[PDB]
């Protein structure tokens, strides 16, 4: 089907004979020449160790919350660690996190019984998932949890339990029987990383290095995790100082601001159009003519 | 005053549905000939104009 335009016609028609006519066989598209990658020129390594390697976590009724911002996040350091009994992610894939880039990350941190790990998931029903700590049903993030019987057992009455992301401080407040003899009855530490995917300037981004920037040529691109393909160009689009992307009626990006120097780049899809094959019948000749629809002959 | 024709269109339904994603294009093949019979109907409309 890629031998010649008549063969693409035969395949389009699902036929070995072709009658006289003009047949729309395919869309011609210029493929990307090279792949651009573009992230903020920032180098601070993110403080995930200050959350994960902390001496004591909080109680689940009174859970900690650390904002992570303005830093480079090598999530491989967490994801490759043998320490974690579960690492389940929602709205993102763990493999994609180093390819990806967020406005902020919120690291929630607390201690639970090993039975209760199941309740730290999107929209769940249960005593943790209402009276203590709940994830949104549309949560985008990772839940990272492990047994801590070697650290948090003694039992250790200093760990206690009673809307999405809600704190609330007779009262049903009670303490865990965490003893080293306890497996579901052990203490477990959990960190929940929540990812903020607003269209504001990204500040927590993977270690994936930026390339040089290319213009007036068809490229694949990635700006702050916004992947695409097109002829990047300079533009007269008067972005106001707060604006970061531009959009068209299809709700697709048609301009971006470069995160390393704040110029406004137009995005246009690479040269493309319908291909129509003009043929006499194959009973007459195997010769064909090709119409590249709406393109100028200089583009072909 | 009488209408005689209307704007001839073609919609490349693989580009409309999947936007040059190959990951989506491979899923769209599992719907079979829905895309070729959409192009066949629009081409019949266009030749009729």
């Amino acid at each position: 089907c890629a031998l010649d335009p008549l063969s693409e016609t035969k395949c389009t028609l699902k036929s070995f004979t072709v009658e006289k006519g003009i047949y729309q066989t395919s869309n011609f598209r210029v493929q990307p020449t090279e792949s651009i990658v573009r992230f903020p020129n920032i180098t601070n390594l993110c403080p995930f160790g200050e959350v994960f390697n902390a001496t004591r976590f909080a109680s689940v009724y009174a859970w900690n919350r650390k904002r992570i911002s303005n830093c480079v996040a090598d999530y491989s350091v967490l994801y490759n660690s043998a320490s974690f009994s579960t690492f389940k992610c929602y709205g993102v894939c763990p493999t994609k996190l180093n390819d990806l880039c967020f406005t902020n990350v919120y690291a929630d941190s607390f201690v639970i019984r090993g039975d209760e790990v199941r309740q730290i998931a999107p929209g769940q029903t249960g005593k943790i998932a209402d009276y203590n700590y709940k994830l949104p049903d549309d949560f985008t993030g990772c839940v990272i949890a492990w047994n801590s019987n070697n650290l948090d057992s003694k039992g250790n009455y200093n760990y206690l339990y009673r809307k999405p992301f809600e704190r609330d401080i007779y009262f049903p407040l009670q303490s865990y029987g965490f003893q080293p003899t306890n497996v579901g009855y052990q203490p477990y530490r959990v960190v929940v990383l929540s990812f903020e995917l607003l269209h504001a300037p990204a500040t927590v981004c993977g270690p994936k290095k930026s390339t040089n920037l290319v213009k007036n040529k068809c490229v694949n691109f990635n700006f702050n995790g916004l992947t695409g393909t097109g002829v990047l160009t300079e533009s007269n689009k008067k972005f106001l100082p707060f604006q970061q992307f531009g959009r068209d009626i299809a709700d697709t990006t048609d301009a971006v601001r470069d995160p390393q120097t704040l110029e406004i780049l137009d995005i246009t899809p690479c040269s493309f159009g319908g291909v129509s094959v003009i043929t006499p019948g194959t009973n007459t000749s195997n010769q064909v003519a090709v119409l590249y629809q709406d393109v100028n002959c200089t583009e072909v | 005053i009488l209408p005689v024709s209307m704007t001839k269109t073609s919609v490349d339904c693989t580009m409309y549905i999947c936007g040059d994603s190959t990951e989506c294009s491979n899923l769209l093949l599992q719907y079979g000939s829905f895309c070729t019979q959409l192009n066949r109907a629009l081409t019949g409309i266009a030749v009729e104009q």
Binding site: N27, D248, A250, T252, T268, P269, G273, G274, Q293, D294 | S5, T7, K8, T9, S10, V11, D12, C13, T14, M15, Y16, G19, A46, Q49
Partner: peptide
Amino acid sequence: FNKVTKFNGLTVLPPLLTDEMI
């Protein structure tokens, strides 16, 4: 003629007869 007046795979094809042929 004066009184009468989409990268997404949508396209408009020209008519066979131009206005000058009509």
